[PDB]
Structure 1
Amino acid sequence: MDIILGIRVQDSVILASSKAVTRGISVLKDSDDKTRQLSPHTLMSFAGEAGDTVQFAEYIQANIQLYSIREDYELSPQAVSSFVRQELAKSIRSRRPYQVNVLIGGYDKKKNKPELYQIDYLGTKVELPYGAHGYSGFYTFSLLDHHYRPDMTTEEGLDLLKLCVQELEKRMPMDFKGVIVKIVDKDGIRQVDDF
């Protein structure tokens, strides 16, 4: 299972997702992202069921951008989090369950506050200082709680993350092959090239 980490630093969100795409016995491809930029000021990362994960990502990406061109103005990341929860609710009673766990991090421009939310697959949004899904949770929830200071600057936060991969690598049983990192902060959405 793919790794997918969150952490909410003092004025930025750093999301990180696994590169490995492993269908069947062989690793097909090893440079594929698992994230879709919703809005100029929202990023959504996703992993879970094969093949479901992709369909359910564009399905949200379209419907959200449609509300943004209808009103010439993007919904606050606070609201965007709720909309996802809604469709993941409706899908567990339906004939087919989707089975996708998602992290929404976005930089709230009105409040001038960065926010993170963890929406598990049944359908539960929960605001969190930091989180994860999968087996990732077991290994990084203890490493983060030791060292995370609310005051950290964007650059402490990167250097915390680089401890967290190198952890996963010792204990994990499956390759994941280094992450991609992205920053979402007040100034737009950029990517660190250095793991």
Structure 2
Amino acid sequence: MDIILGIRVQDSVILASSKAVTRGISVLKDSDDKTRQLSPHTLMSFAGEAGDTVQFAEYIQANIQLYSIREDYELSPQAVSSFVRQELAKSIRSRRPYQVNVLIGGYDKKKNKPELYQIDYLGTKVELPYGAHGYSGFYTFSLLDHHYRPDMTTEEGLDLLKLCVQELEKRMPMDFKGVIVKIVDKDGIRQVDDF
């Protein structure tokens, strides 16, 4: 149902998250922000079962912020993605598994590099130039396969995301009420005003 999109360009990562929250035949919310800031340079968008999503995301955020306060050091995006993958891989074999899929976008200050990770409720992690969770992938991947260049600027990436969102609004059968777009780069995390 939910759209979770991510494009990693030359100098930043861009995350798009559908704004719609729907229970039954009612769109309860049209302005929902499906991301949590795990660290100043690491953002995580999430989608899946009701309640599981926000619970898991805020639990991960709590642990990452606790680490940052304990060590006075910001974990790399790779380490954060490994921690989240371990949590999901442990949850999948518990009594009630978290049914959450996440995209983790970070700017590693050490490597000075944008990293984008895709992890599903099973604990399947991959680093991708562009990733998508759920049925939205079935449209976006091929589109990016044609239009994505590794040396794209953030504005080019935003035009590409606009193209993807237009394709989802055209062909996807559910009205997800637009997307919230966020950019993670060396300067931190900002939100694109209007999209």
Cα distance in 1 for residues equivalent to 2:57 and 2:152: 31
Q: Could you tell me how far apart the structure 1 residues matched to 2:162 and 2:128 are?
A: 21
Partner of 1:7: 7
Tell me, what secondary structure is at the counterpart of 1:194?
A: coil
Aligned position for 2:23:
23
- Kindly report the root-mean-square deviation, in angstroms, between the aligned alpha carbons of the 2 structures: 0.7
Q: Secondary structure in 2 aligned to 1:6?
A: strand
Q: Deviation per CA, 1:81-105, whole angstroms, max 9, x where unpaired?
A: 0000011011111111111000000
Secondary structure of residue in 2 paired with 1:28: strand
**1:38-187 correspondence to structure 2 within 5 Å:** 38-187=38-187
Q: Partners in 2 of 1:10 and 1:37 — Cα distance?
A: 21
Q: CA deviation at 1:78?
A: 1.1
Q: How far apart, CA to CA, are the structure 2 residues paired with 1:55 and 1:149?
A: 35
> Cα distance, 1:67 vs. partner?
0.8
Report SS of the residue matched to 1:122: coil
CA shift, 1:179, in A, is: 0.4
Find the aligned partners of 2:190 and 2:98 in 1 and give their Cα distance.
30
> 1:24 Cα deviation (Å)?
1.6
In the alignment, structure 2 segments of 5+ residues that lack a partner are: none
Secondary structure of the 2:134 match is coil
Distance 1:194 1:93 in 2: 41
* CA distance in 1 between partners of 2:67 and 2:169 (Å): 41
Aligned to 2:176, what secondary structure does the other structure show?
Answer: coil
* TM-score normalised by the chain length of structure 2: 0.98
CA distance in structure 1 between the partners assigned to 2:82 and 2:48 by the alignment? 19
Q: What is the CA–CA distance in structure 1 between the aligned matches of 2:160 and 2:107, rounded to whole Å? A: 20
Deviation by residue 1:116-169 (Cα, 9 ceiling, x = unmatched): 100111111111111101100000111111111111111111111111111111
Distance in 2 (CA, whole Å) between partners of 1:194 and 1:29 is 18
Q: Distance in 1 between matches of 2:97 and 2:91?
A: 5
Scaled by the length of structure 1, the TM-score of the pair is 0.98
Query: For 1:69-89, what per-residue CA distance to the aligned partner results, in whole angstroms no more than 9, with x for missing partners?
Result: 111111111100000001101
Give the drift of 1:185. Answer: 0.5
Q: Secondary structure at the match of 2:31?
A: coil
Q: CA deviation at 1:40?
A: 0.4
The Cα of 1:177 is off from its aligned counterpart by: 1.2
Q: Secondary structure at the match of 2:22?
A: coil
> Matched residues, percent identical?
100
Deviation by residue 1:24-48 (Cα, 9 ceiling, x = unmatched): 2201111011110000010001010
Give the distance between the partners of 1:69 and 1:52, measured in 2 at CA: 26
Q: How many residues were matched structurally?
A: 195
SS of alignment partner, residue 183 of structure 1: strand
Whole-angstrom distance in 2 between the partners of 1:139 and 1:132: 9
- Alpha-carbon distance in structure 1 between the residues aligned to 2:7 and 2:110: 21
